[PDB]
Write an enzyme that holds these catalytic residues in place. Structure first.
Site, PDB file in Angstrom:
ATOM      1  N   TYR A 105     -13.450  39.053  35.132  1.00 11.67           N
ATOM      2  CA  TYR A 105     -14.554  39.095  34.191  1.00 11.67           C
ATOM      3  C   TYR A 105     -14.863  40.514  33.787  1.00 11.67           C
ATOM      4  O   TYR A 105     -14.955  40.835  32.594  1.00 11.67           O
ATOM      5  CB  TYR A 105     -15.834  38.449  34.744  1.00 11.67           C
ATOM      6  CG  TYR A 105     -15.728  36.960  34.824  1.00 11.67           C
ATOM      7  CD1 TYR A 105     -14.769  36.357  35.635  1.00 11.67           C
ATOM      8  CD2 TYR A 105     -16.584  36.153  34.132  1.00 11.67           C
ATOM      9  CE1 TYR A 105     -14.628  34.975  35.673  1.00 11.67           C
ATOM     10  CE2 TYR A 105     -16.466  34.751  34.167  1.00 11.67           C
ATOM     11  CZ  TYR A 105     -15.510  34.178  34.980  1.00 11.67           C
ATOM     12  OH  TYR A 105     -15.353  32.823  35.043  1.00 11.67           O
TER      13      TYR A 105
ATOM     14  N   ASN B 180     -20.199  25.871  35.887  1.00 13.40           N
ATOM     15  CA  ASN B 180     -19.876  24.927  34.836  1.00 13.40           C
ATOM     16  C   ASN B 180     -20.724  23.672  34.990  1.00 13.40           C
ATOM     17  O   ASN B 180     -21.453  23.529  35.969  1.00 13.40           O
ATOM     18  CB  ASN B 180     -18.380  24.560  34.921  1.00 13.40           C
ATOM     19  CG  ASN B 180     -17.453  25.541  34.164  1.00 13.40           C
ATOM     20  OD1 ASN B 180     -17.884  26.257  33.257  1.00 13.40           O
ATOM     21  ND2 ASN B 180     -16.156  25.553  34.545  1.00 13.40           N
TER      22      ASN B 180
ATOM     23  N   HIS C 196     -14.839  30.297  26.528  1.00 14.59           N
ATOM     24  CA  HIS C 196     -16.290  30.153  26.381  1.00 14.59           C
ATOM     25  C   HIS C 196     -16.906  30.984  25.251  1.00 14.59           C
ATOM     26  O   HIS C 196     -18.080  31.401  25.310  1.00 14.59           O
ATOM     27  CB  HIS C 196     -17.016  30.466  27.689  1.00 14.59           C
ATOM     28  CG  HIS C 196     -16.642  29.591  28.851  1.00 14.59           C
ATOM     29  ND1 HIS C 196     -17.458  28.561  29.284  1.00 14.59           N
ATOM     30  CD2 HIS C 196     -15.597  29.638  29.726  1.00 14.59           C
ATOM     31  CE1 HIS C 196     -16.926  28.010  30.365  1.00 14.59           C
ATOM     32  NE2 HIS C 196     -15.801  28.643  30.659  1.00 14.59           N
TER      33      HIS C 196
HETATM   34  C1  HEM Z   1      -9.271  31.927  38.006  1.00 13.12           C
HETATM   35  C2  HEM Z   1      -9.976  31.162  37.200  1.00 13.12           C
HETATM   36  C3  HEM Z   1     -10.840  31.737  36.067  1.00 13.12           C
HETATM   37  C4  HEM Z   1     -10.664  32.875  35.406  1.00 13.12           C
HETATM   38  C5  HEM Z   1      -9.523  33.892  35.545  1.00 13.12           C
HETATM   39  C6  HEM Z   1     -11.740  32.980  34.449  1.00 13.12           C
HETATM   40  C7  HEM Z   1     -11.886  33.962  33.509  1.00 13.12           C
HETATM   41  C8  HEM Z   1     -12.897  34.045  32.581  1.00 13.12           C
HETATM   42  C9  HEM Z   1     -13.070  35.106  31.613  1.00 13.12           C
HETATM   43  C10 HEM Z   1     -12.125  36.307  31.483  1.00 13.12           C
HETATM   44  C11 HEM Z   1     -14.169  34.855  30.910  1.00 13.12           C
HETATM   45  C12 HEM Z   1     -14.780  35.720  29.797  1.00 13.12           C
HETATM   46  C13 HEM Z   1     -15.740  36.737  30.428  1.00 13.12           C
HETATM   47  C14 HEM Z   1     -16.362  37.658  29.396  1.00 13.12           C
HETATM   48  O1  HEM Z   1     -15.642  38.015  28.437  1.00 13.12           O
HETATM   49  O2  HEM Z   1     -17.542  38.022  29.535  1.00 13.12           O
HETATM   50  C15 HEM Z   1     -14.750  33.622  31.421  1.00 13.12           C
HETATM   51  C16 HEM Z   1     -15.885  33.026  31.001  1.00 13.12           C
HETATM   52  C17 HEM Z   1     -16.578  32.033  31.661  1.00 13.12           C
HETATM   53  N1  HEM Z   1     -16.141  31.309  32.746  1.00 13.12           N
HETATM   54 FE1  HEM Z   1     -14.437  31.696  33.797  1.00 13.12          FE
HETATM   55  N2  HEM Z   1     -12.580  31.880  34.573  1.00 13.12           N
HETATM   56  C18 HEM Z   1     -12.047  31.093  35.579  1.00 13.12           C
HETATM   57  C19 HEM Z   1     -12.572  29.904  36.049  1.00 13.12           C
HETATM   58  C20 HEM Z   1     -13.869  29.494  35.866  1.00 13.12           C
HETATM   59  C21 HEM Z   1     -14.605  28.525  36.648  1.00 13.12           C
HETATM   60  C22 HEM Z   1     -14.025  27.733  37.815  1.00 13.12           C
HETATM   61  C23 HEM Z   1     -15.845  28.497  36.168  1.00 13.12           C
HETATM   62  C24 HEM Z   1     -17.014  27.670  36.637  1.00 13.12           C
HETATM   63  C25 HEM Z   1     -17.208  27.504  37.962  1.00 13.12           C
HETATM   64  C26 HEM Z   1     -15.941  29.404  35.041  1.00 13.12           C
HETATM   65  C27 HEM Z   1     -17.037  29.603  34.239  1.00 13.12           C
HETATM   66  C28 HEM Z   1     -17.090  30.418  33.162  1.00 13.12           C
HETATM   67  C29 HEM Z   1     -18.232  30.550  32.319  1.00 13.12           C
HETATM   68  C30 HEM Z   1     -19.508  29.738  32.377  1.00 13.12           C
HETATM   69  C31 HEM Z   1     -17.900  31.580  31.330  1.00 13.12           C
HETATM   70  C32 HEM Z   1     -18.810  32.035  30.235  1.00 13.12           C
HETATM   71  C33 HEM Z   1     -19.765  33.086  30.767  1.00 13.12           C
HETATM   72  C34 HEM Z   1     -20.686  33.443  29.611  1.00 13.12           C
HETATM   73  O3  HEM Z   1     -21.418  32.524  29.160  1.00 13.12           O
HETATM   74  O4  HEM Z   1     -20.665  34.614  29.175  1.00 13.12           O
HETATM   75  N3  HEM Z   1     -14.726  29.974  34.895  1.00 13.12           N
HETATM   76  N4  HEM Z   1     -13.920  33.149  32.427  1.00 13.12           N
END
Ligand code: HEM
EC number: 1.11.1.6
Lengths: 498, 498, 498, 498
Positions: free
Chosen positions: D338, D128, D56
């Site tokens: 996160y 999402n 993202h």
């Molecule tokens: C085990 C599964 C997942 C893991 C390990 C994971 C991990 C991560 C990580 C490490 C980031 C970056 C966070 C940062 O640097 O601030 C991220 C961003 C993000 N993830 Fe996940 N994610 C997973 C599944 C999901 C799911 C299922 C969703 C939605 C329901 C999601 C939505 C998002 C969103 C929207 C961002 C961006 C947040 C922003 O705009 O700063 N992710 N994810």
């Protein structure tokens, strides 16, 4: 030697021209921005220091060998402990509370961090010089260590803070007794025992499980210093232990420890009268006797302290097949914490540094990041793949597991028949210590309480009386008379403390 | 208090539930991955430590005030030194070689780092407790500090390494004499003088320039410890100086220093018989007398040592209008090095932390980066711009400059009439020291040479004889008899050293 | 394969058990904290990204070889350019403004970063696809790049900001003309020339000096895209150039460039009618003709893009004997900036990564730091030393130096006889471009000005008329009619822009 | 304005003198090392970039407000959702795979990250634009994301790698169907729905528990682009979505979403015919209808994109009382990941940056670390303490917990009555899509398979036939004829890919 060589190079391998004078406009003029050798050398100098360990900042170590001399194959399938096996080791010793340049002879716990470079990975047994610890839940650990370090305003260590924490967390009594006794001040690292402290799981080739304790019994004996002697040494030679280890090995005097285990059958772990998953408890040698495994010898000094000792990164997560963790909450917290700290302290690729690499081939799904020295070429980055790059996919119960059932909760562990906070400490004071050791113990504890805020002293008297009524009264009497030893590394009272 | 409060929060402000027990599956079960309070608290604990300063790791300080009591407006336009001006200050004291937890009473140079929070920016006068230093070119500084620290294999400090460096860099003699004399061991930080050491440039309102030396003369006098006393204290109280400062201020005993300058007219700087741009030289008070400016008082302890002292970032680059650097090569190297080290040690935005922010408005062309607390909104990021966001564009010779001419070279500074490596040191030993101080000096130096590798000792005898033939013979005689004091913080010899 | 292997390992080399399922309490239960494989893999995943380059984030490259085919030994002693020498190379191509995932076919400058792995160190010639640049003092560079990137509030690129900067810094005209002409959009990296841009110093075996310009003339010719074509490709294939390079080499189509120099005698550098130390100026080939040196061939793709290309760290400070910098202020700023950025981007030990190591032996006075892979054992850390560990100590004028004289100032470089901001740009538009190229140029520039804030447009019309009265009127007429091409990568106007 | 002001300052607040010219020895001379303004500005420029998010990276956002318009107090005690409550919000939208400068209109999932600044802490609902995801265990997530990014050698995205992963992980089918359908290409972020995806736990004032799904239904409708349109836009305006959001809000066109929940009674969660803890499953609205809560409005642009959007750090661990996690393994992994990534990306004190601070008072047991802006003074660092500094110590079952029982295992979740990998995807294709959507879907999927390695194509045909026999045959027929759409952001085939 190259045609234009000058005796040393810059970082790109080109001749440096001078390691002694900067580039100026004439002899009397300013330094120019493009003195790239000045810049490289200073910018590196400015980035030489890394965060010290928290805790166990002050330490040193040596390499050696472990030889298995008995047959314990019935208890574990781990290659490192199979009959006749010899394995290269690295051992780092340390204090706990003091920072990088703090004296070695402060009263404290000592670390006993042992790595075995096995054929099936690096196996780290990250122990201390005591079989128990102050706490039984890792949520309390951060608080404990901060209480052992410095006040937020004055930057001083403070016995009032230390006793406030200990008296409000009575689970600490067993280990505080051990620390305040003779073994709080080892004469040398060669003359102290090492212990795993925690119960670990051993699994044999047939899948049968035993709960195990590790004991490393020094062949040099256990020898300790008095408070007064340790204080004197702290002034005269702040690196007394570091020096002793290096000089002993250099002279060919190789220190040894014999490893023994206690082995508890799996089901008996759940019913034993002391909780084997409670790090504040020892397991009686009458109930579960020590069984010899083999001998550890240290025989080789580091060639570079910083690269081989300071940059070493030990972790209880570094198990190998045949050896697992246990339901000890403190151990489970440690499984996360070390690797995490090391990513910050050293770097993402801490386990690619030579001292931390295993002997066997690593085939791990991790790629990229800063300072990636050993890259994976065009290997697939995902699994399953259709490219012939292998992955793991064993399903079902793991061989180093156990059962659990309950609701999500935050609460103390259930007590076994003979569990409490004070009984084992008592036994130590009454039955194990000699008369002379008891006399010294009173002077130590009274000394440690000198200048402590009165309300905290009063709680300490109740705490010590719970350990043993007689010793507790003796301590109280001495504190009320303002007597007792000076304790190396800490004091209380005055305008800069609580 | 919120409706569901529990006594503390997580990092997002939600109730933490427990600071004492982890989240488990039943009382006997494992810790779950989603104990986010355990994770946050441990991950922060693991990132509490920052790289210690290199050098000057061990230190503490206090806030205070500087009052101008004389009229020096003819020499400088700097607001901080205009008649009647009172300015808030921060002062950090330190040793040089030892690490974060090393004893305060080792024989060493002491740092005297002074910030003035002026109306036209933060002005940092980053001094020491000596008017000179060991070296006159910054290329040598990295080598020097590493020689004062630890051997690469054993991790021990070693007098052989220290003397090998000093005897091979004879420019060191003036400062080594000062260090080995009485002032190498201040009793307290309150009882030592501070000095800018370097020549700085002062510029007045009309553009007239003077070269200046700063001298901070303690109103508490200069009082020192013997080697034996300092060694004893190192054992008994490793934080003796830190404690003394905090307790003195807490009791209302506010230490003071009077500031004096020497002022050399611009043109005389180029012709004076000692090189004012050579940091190994003092400037005679007969030729250029001390002129009083005002008085520094320390009157307020920190509320948080780490945030206000450890995280403070002083730099000689932090000049203000009216005060400039000089052609001293060592000072010019310092203009680069501090800010660079602080980017690594603390962070890119080190100067946004409260202790490092100026009092006046910052309007600086720097944006983004990690941990950017105070952002610039929609301000233009480039210049010139047509959006009304101001920039600087003064052209021509700068008011705090000087002239240079020559070819790019790496060589020693040209000698003035009376420049050499040994003369001023001699003068110190022969004319300034008393008989008793000379006797002590011999015992100190002989002690510092005990156990030093013989070839290095032999070079040391020649070095000391160059300072003074009589003292040098006395030192030689004592070293050949293996006599001399133990020196707090260092020794030589044995299998773990050179 | 080990006895208990499962197909992959953790970081310690122990079998990982599963790369596909986490460790839970039963199939339906929570994940436990001690799933150390989940933790290691996620914590590494979370630290895979490193800061992108600023500027030149988007790029790729290949390895190759340089062969010297002519005799230029009279101009330089550098081993890499001696007769008959063949040297391994690495070349990274790039755009400038766009971030890591930005399309390759935006209108922009392209980088041409070339490393030679020489017998006397790594020699980096860090060029662009143009012989000039927008600026002649490095203080302006930060402003320029920020103007080429995004608005602080909306995060959009904005032509108004770009033109505000360019029109307020008229020194930009020569390079802005080049950029807006045909060569702003290379069809491929194979079909563009490379240039050192700056004047460098060459020194021969006798110490004689020449000022040199480098020109890498593509054997594939210079071929460019239209604005419309480049826009289409940006949508269809954002990695068009990266793909083209990799596929061409994979198919055996090895791109080549011939290296030519211009060689100006040392003294003529000071008197030539255009300032050779002004990066906004070309040097006439009538006055100083191109002299052939040899041929560069790219013939080998990376095996790992991240380890070999992303982690490569090029620097103009990486000179070798025989090649030096020059009085070009922009080059002197670059000598500091790259190494500094790389300490942050990659790490302190960036030059120990395989791609950045030289072929010859490094003997450098730098020790310790994070991720120190190749330690120095017990080598002395200081100089001079009595231990046989060599150092450099050449004194006197350096072989790659020059003279300077003056007072410290901040001002523009003095003008040579024919120096100005607009003349060379004019010559390009009037004399070098064809009629069709002039027609395209008008449509490009008018397009780039569409939607630009009116006051900035008005300044742009004056700017273009200074380049050439006729072209400037044609641009003005087209802008007033709101005609012109869409420019790949940027636009102006609307509520989210200036 | 200060007396000596010049229009801007250095970092210490002193006048900068020039933002346009460097400090040189005369106009023609070299830059001096002590140009501290050049050094500060460049060293900061070199540290402006921070690691992009993984995943993202590409995104933007806005502030707004959430108003509760219905009464759901029977389901939760969370203050944010109590009747009539209005709460400030921040929402960041994003793609998933592409890097910082990648086009907004690639086919991909979109992020919907929503923070509520509640009276009892920051509550982050990190969603999402889809109610499901590709995977049901977090061990697979690292592999998935790497498969969506670039090949290790060429650095290109590759459909062969994407399909190899998807076809070998059939749990992906439900989400791959959603992605390949119309909603893979939102026209704008304003014209897409948001979803929590996971089941969360709601707890009311009496302790009663419901499992909840969140649905944010756009008041602007759901509008999508064709593959061809999105490709065109990617070329013409890589920041189309970022621009649209900023311009819409600037013009006063405030986008809205209505929040609905599904609420499943606690016990029914364990028996429902689809697994609510399986992130690949939707919960039927016939069984559990949507219940309105309130309305989200976005109404305020950022003033600084980097400080307020790029540096924002959202985390599913940021729950508040009344809202908990659930047994969904993917959610439990997110609780750790996160915060961990943000410590590296931004810093240890990421939650002290203004955008990440809560509105209520933080009283958290975390101290020290780099860039600690808001220190805790002399507050106690340990618990319990006798100093009046509060802590939390609730014991027993937590209000947001649940039960578990079993042995430690790595295996798939047990199937409910109607769980499988393909059924829900089928339902989407057969029953929800229109004829025209099915036609488009075939062209999309066939296009996405063009150039894919034949063995992987063959597995894809079986995969699609499992979803639906008719659609799968249609896709197969089109792929065998080499027909299909170009897919924005990715392709397959050629010498630089698998
Ligand atoms: C085990 C599964 C997942 C893991 C390990 C994971 C991990 C991560 C990580 C490490 C980031 C970056 C966070 C940062 O640097 O601030 C991220 C961003 C993000 N993830 Fe996940 N994610 C997973 C599944 C999901 C799911 C299922 C969703 C939605 C329901 C999601 C939505 C998002 C969103 C929207 C961002 C961006 C947040 C922003 O705009 O700063 N992710 N994810």
């Amino acid at each position: 030697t190259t045609p234009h060589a000058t005796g040393s190079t810059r970082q790109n391998g080109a001749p440096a021209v001078s390691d002694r004078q900067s580039l100026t406009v004439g002899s009397e003029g300013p330094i120019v921005l493009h003195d790239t050798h000045l810049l490289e050398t200073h910018q590196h100098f400015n980035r030489m220091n890394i965060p010290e360990r928290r805790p166990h900042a002050k330490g040193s170590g040596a390499f050696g060998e472990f030889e298995v001399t008995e047959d314990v194959s019935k208890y574990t399938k781990a290659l490192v402990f199979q009959p006749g096996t010899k394995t290269e080791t690295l051992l780092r010793f340390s204090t706990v509370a003091g920072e990088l340049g703090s004296p070695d002879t402060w009263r404290d716990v000592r670390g006993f961090a042992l790595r075995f470079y096995t054929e099936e990975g690096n196996y780290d047994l990250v122990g201390n010089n005591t079989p128990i610890f102050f706490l039984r839940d890792p949520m309390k650990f951060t608080h404990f260590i901060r209480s052992q370090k410095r006040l937020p305003d004055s930057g001083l260590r403070d016995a009032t803070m230390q006793w406030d924490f200990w008296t409000n967390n009575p689970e600490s009594a067993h280990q505080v007794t051990y620390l305040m006794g003779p073994r709080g001040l080892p004469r040398t690292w060669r003359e102290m025992n090492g212990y795993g402290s925690h119960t670990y799981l051993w699994v044999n080739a047939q899948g049968e499980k035993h709960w195990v304790k590790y004991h490393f019994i020094s062949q040099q004996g256990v020898h300790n210093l008095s408070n007064d002697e340790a204080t004197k040494i702290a002034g005269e030679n702040a690196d007394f232990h570091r020096q002793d280890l290096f000089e002993s090995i250099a002279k060919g005097d190789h220190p040894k420890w014999d490893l023994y285990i206690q082995a508890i059958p799996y089901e008996e772990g759940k019913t034993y009268r002391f909780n084997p998953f409670d790090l504040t408890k020892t397991i009686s040698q009458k109930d579960y006797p020590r069984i010899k495994v083999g001998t550890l010898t240290l025989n080789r000094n580091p060639e570079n302290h910083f690269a081989q000792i300071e940059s070493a990164a030990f972790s209880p997560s570094n198990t190998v097949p045949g050896i697992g963790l246990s339901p000890d909450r403190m151990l489970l917290g440690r499984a996360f914490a070390y690797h995490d700290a090391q990513l910050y302290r050293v770097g993402a690729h801490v386990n690619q540094l030579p001292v931390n690499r295993p002997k066997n081939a690593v085939h791990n799904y991790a790629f990229e990041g800063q300072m990636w020295y050993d890259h994976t070429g065009d290997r697939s980055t995902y699994v399953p793949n259709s490219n012939g790059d292998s992955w793991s996919d064993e399903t079902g119960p793991v061989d180093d597991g156990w059962e659990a059932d309950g609701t999500l909760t935050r609460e103390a562990q259930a007590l076994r028949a003979d569990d409490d906070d004070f009984g084992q400490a008592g036994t130590l004071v009454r039955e194990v210590f000699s008369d002379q050791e008891r006399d010294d113990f009173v002077e130590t504890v009274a000394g440690a309480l000198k200048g402590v805020r009165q309300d905290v002293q009063a709680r300490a008297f109740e705490y010590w009386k719970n350990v043993d009524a007689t010793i507790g009264q003796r301590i109280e009497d001495e504190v009320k008379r303002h007597e007792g030893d000076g304790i190396p590394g800490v004091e209380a009272g005055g305008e800069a403390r609580i």
